[PDB]
Coordinates of C-alpha atoms in Angstrom, one line a residue:
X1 CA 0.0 0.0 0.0
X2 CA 0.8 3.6 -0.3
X3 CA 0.4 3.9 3.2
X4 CA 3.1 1.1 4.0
X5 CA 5.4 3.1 1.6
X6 CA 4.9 6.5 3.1
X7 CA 5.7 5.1 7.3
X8 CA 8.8 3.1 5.6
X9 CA 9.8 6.6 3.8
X10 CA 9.2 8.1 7.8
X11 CA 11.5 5.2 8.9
X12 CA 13.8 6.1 6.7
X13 CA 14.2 9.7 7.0
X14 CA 14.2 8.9 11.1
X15 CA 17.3 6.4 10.4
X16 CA 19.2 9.4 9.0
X17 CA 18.8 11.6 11.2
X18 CA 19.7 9.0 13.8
X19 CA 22.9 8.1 12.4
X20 CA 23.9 11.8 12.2
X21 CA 22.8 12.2 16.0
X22 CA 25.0 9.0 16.7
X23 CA 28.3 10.2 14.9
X24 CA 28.1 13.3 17.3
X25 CA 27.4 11.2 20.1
X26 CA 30.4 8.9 19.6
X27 CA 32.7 11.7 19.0
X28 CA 32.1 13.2 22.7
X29 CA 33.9 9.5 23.3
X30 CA 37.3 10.1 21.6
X31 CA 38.8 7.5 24.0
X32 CA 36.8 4.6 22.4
X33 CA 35.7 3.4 25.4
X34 CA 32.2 2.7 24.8
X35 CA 33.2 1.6 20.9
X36 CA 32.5 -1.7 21.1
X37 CA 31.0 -4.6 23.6
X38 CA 32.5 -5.1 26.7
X39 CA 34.7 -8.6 25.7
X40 CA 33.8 -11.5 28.4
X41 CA 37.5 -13.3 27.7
X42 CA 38.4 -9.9 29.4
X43 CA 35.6 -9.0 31.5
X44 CA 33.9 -12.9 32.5
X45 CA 31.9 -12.0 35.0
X46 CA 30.5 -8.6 33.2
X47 CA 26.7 -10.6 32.5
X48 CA 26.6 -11.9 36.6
X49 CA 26.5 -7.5 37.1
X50 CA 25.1 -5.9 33.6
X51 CA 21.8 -7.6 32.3
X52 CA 21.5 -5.3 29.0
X53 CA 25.1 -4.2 27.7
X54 CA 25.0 -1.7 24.8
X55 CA 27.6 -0.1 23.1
X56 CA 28.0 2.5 19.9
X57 CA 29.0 -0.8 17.4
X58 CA 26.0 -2.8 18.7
X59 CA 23.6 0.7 18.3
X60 CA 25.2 1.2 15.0
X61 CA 24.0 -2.7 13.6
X62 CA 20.1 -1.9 15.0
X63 CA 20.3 1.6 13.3
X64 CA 21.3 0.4 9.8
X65 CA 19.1 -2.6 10.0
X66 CA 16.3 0.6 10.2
X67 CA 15.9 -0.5 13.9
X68 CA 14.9 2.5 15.6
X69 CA 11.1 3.2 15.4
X70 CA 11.5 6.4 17.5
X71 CA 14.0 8.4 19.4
X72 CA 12.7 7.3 22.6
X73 CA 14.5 3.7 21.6
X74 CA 17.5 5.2 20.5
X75 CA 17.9 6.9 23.6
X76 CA 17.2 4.1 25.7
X77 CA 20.0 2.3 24.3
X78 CA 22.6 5.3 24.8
X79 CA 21.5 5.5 28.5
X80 CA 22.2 1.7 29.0
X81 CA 25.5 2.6 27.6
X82 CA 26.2 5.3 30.5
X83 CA 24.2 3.9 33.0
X84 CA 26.2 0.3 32.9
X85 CA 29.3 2.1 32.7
X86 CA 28.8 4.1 36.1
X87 CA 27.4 0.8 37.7
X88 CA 30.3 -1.5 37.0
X89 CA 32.9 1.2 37.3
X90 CA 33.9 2.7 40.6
X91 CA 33.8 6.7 40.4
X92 CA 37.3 7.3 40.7
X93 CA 38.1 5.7 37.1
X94 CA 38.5 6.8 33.9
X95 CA 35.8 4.4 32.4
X96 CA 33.0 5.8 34.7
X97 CA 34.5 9.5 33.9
X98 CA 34.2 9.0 30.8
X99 CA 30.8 8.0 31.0
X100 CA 29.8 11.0 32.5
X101 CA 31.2 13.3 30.3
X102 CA 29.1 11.3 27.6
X103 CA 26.1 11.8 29.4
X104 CA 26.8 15.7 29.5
X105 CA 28.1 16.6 26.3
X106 CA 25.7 14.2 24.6
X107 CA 22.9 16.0 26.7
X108 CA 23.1 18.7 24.1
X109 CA 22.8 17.0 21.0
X110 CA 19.7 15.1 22.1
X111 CA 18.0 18.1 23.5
X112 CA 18.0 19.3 20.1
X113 CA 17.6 15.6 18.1
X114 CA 13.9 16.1 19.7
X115 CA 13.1 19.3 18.6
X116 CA 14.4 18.0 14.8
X117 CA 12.1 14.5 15.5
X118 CA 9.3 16.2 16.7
X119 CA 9.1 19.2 14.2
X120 CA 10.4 17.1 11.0
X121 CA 7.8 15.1 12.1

């Protein structure tokens, strides 16, 4: 249907935007840290502390594969990505640092990523 066509065309133009909002969000991370999956042969116990892991390379796959319905998703996944971070970390590290300068700097982008979903409709 037309219909079908025009919410896929929605999806689409949503999937753009989204990878946009997620190349600014990974460069407030010029570390790498959050880069790619925590790796259990380094970190074996990481699942018996952190239910849902998420990283950028793992958000990446979901938002090519059109993935993201909305921004509410998108953002869910970039909070597990802080949120895990400042739970297994201690504060005085550079991992959980890291995190929250993330979470500050990528603060910005997002308060204006919903103006852009909301008014591009």
């Amino acid at each position: 249907s037309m219909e079908q066509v025009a919410m896929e065309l929605r999806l689409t133009e949503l999937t753009r935007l989204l990878r946009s909002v997620l190349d600014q969000l990974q460069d407030k991370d010029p570390a790498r840290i959050f880069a790619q999956p925590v790796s259990l042969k380094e970190v074996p116990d990481y699942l018996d502390h952190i239910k849902h892991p998420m990283d950028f390379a793992t958000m990446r796959k979901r938002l090519e594969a059109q993935g993201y319905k909305n921004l509410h998703e998108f953002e869910e996944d970039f909070d597990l990505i802080i949120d895990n971070c400042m739970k297994y970390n201690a504060r005085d590290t550079v991992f959980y640092r890291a995190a929250v300068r993330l979470r500050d700097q990528g603060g910005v982008v997002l308060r204006q990523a919903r103006r852009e979903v909301d008014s591009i409709g």
